[PDB]
Write a protein that binds this ligand. Structure first.
Ligand SMILES: O=C(O)COc1ccc(Cl)cc1Cl
Ligand code: NA
Length: 428
């Protein structure tokens, strides 16, 4: 009860901002690297852990606002940010950590959208290789230095949800109708590097929810908290499990060579519709990631105020040129999710939110005068502390130690094979 979350519409507007658009096409690859038994258990595991960490971020936001409003403060005409909460609760070293990590991740999450945009357009008009489509789409994305901000974020998310729901159910039904071939093989785990570069792509997937609660996070007065609101957290499962299971079931071990699943499906108007919807979706996730970087760069350089559109744009172009060169040089759609999710997501989404919560409520004085008692599904404090320590140690060893070695070895293998400035990655 009294969950500071809102009504049914705001509650579903939080599951809408659970971006799983682009990574949806690289999950059969991970299944072919792991097998059927490990692919499902790990998806459920990481989905539950992601929901837990999102809850942690929420309770920390509420704790900070509640502490600040008591000593005398007005939060009117001023939205709170993540690094501000970290600075207010822990100190300045945490304000530096939660800024460096959240800026590096936002830099590397747009290279991926540019790569995917240049990759999916190849399965409509394959007269120009993927590097020329990267030239063209980078020149198109370098025009976001003219769009100031977004006037509305509700409609974009509510349309992205449907654009994802069409593709996640085309990929399953087309694969079922196509059936199995004659002499396809489902070999499970063979090498270690492959198992652990698949597990990290699965870790990456379920950290997109908590990453938005670290940037926008709108909150308001509490409501009565109908308990049906929880049934919107487990709606990404009907998007990710059937589509990834039914493509691997049909196409076997031909997927450890094709990271984009559109390359195996038979061409039809439905496939063309899904490519276009995915392009429209991945063109929105690029601006929603490049806007905070623009804001932070303008604040840092000391030029927040600008009246002409020609001055803002011109000053705002050391931030989109490395996002372009990095997409041109390393165009590895699918092997890059593992590296990014092993080096940045494991710290941004999992270890830091659970370490801040452990370090905040250390003393009994901080635990008796708390803004929110422990939830109904976790009564004691020892339960929360044990769960946090487990999350920290697990993501530290399996997510960073093994995942890191495996994913970086795979990323270097791709460069050894295809070279730098590759012309067409995984084209016949
Ligand atoms: O389209 C994508 O890139 C997949 O969505 C995500 C998945 C994981 C994380 Cl951390 C962030 C995002 Cl935006
Ligand atoms: Na991967």
């Amino acid at each position: 009860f009294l969950w500071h979350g809102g009504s049914v519409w705001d509650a579903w507007f939080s599951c809408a901002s659970n971006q799983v658009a682009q990574v949806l096409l690289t999950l059969p690859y991970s299944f072919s690297q792991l097998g059927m038994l490990s692919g499902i258990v790990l998806q459920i595991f990481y989905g539950l852990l992601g929901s837990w960490t999102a809850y942690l971020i929420s309770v920390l936001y509420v704790e900070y606002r509640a502490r600040k409003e008591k000593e005398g403060k007005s939060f009117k005409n001023h939205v709170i940010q993540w690094f501000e909460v970290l600075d207010g609760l822990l100190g300045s070293y945490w304000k530096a950590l939660g800024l460096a990590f959240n800026c590096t991740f936002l830099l590397f999450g747009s290279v991926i959208q540019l790569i995917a945009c240049a990759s999916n357009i190849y399965y409509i008009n394959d007269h120009l290789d993927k590097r020329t489509w990267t030239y063209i789409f980078g020149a198109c994305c370098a025009t976001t230095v003219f769009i100031p901000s977004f006037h509305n974020y509700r409609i974009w998310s509510f349309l992205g949800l449907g654009m994802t729901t069409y593709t996640a159910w085309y990929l399953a039904i087309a694969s079922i109708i196509h059936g199995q071939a004659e002499g396809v093989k489902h070999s499970g785990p063979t090498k270690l590097v492959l198992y652990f570069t698949g597990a990290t792509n699965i870790l990456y997937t379920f950290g997109g929810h908590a990453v938005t609660v670290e940037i926008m996070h709108a909150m308001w007065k509490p409501q009565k908290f109908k308990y049906i609101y929880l049934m919107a957290t487990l709606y990404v499962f009907t998007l990710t499990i059937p589509s990834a299971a039914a493509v691997y079931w049909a196409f076997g071990d031909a997927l450890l060579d094709h990271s984009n699943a559109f390359s195996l499906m038979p061409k039809n108007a439905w496939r063309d519709a899904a490519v276009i919807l995915m392009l429209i979706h991945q063109f929105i996730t690029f601006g929603f990631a490049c806007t905070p970087l623009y804001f932070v760069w303008e604040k840092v350089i000391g030029m927040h105020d600008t009246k002409s559109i020609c001055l803002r744009a011109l000053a705002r172009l050391p931030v989109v040129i490395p996002i372009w060169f990095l997409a041109i040089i390393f165009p590895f759609f699918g092997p890059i999710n593992s590296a990014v999710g092993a080096l940045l997501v494991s710290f941004t989404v999992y270890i830091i939110p659970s370490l801040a919560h452990m370090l905040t409520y250390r003393s009994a004085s901080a635990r008796q005068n708390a803004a929110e008692k422990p939830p109904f599904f976790m009564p004691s404090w020892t339960a929360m502390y044990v769960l946090n320590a487990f999350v920290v140690v697990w993501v530290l060893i399996v997510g960073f130690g093994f995942g890191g070695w495996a994913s970086v070895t795979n990323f270097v293998r791709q460069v050894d094979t295809f070279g730098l400035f590759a012309k067409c990655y995984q084209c016949k």
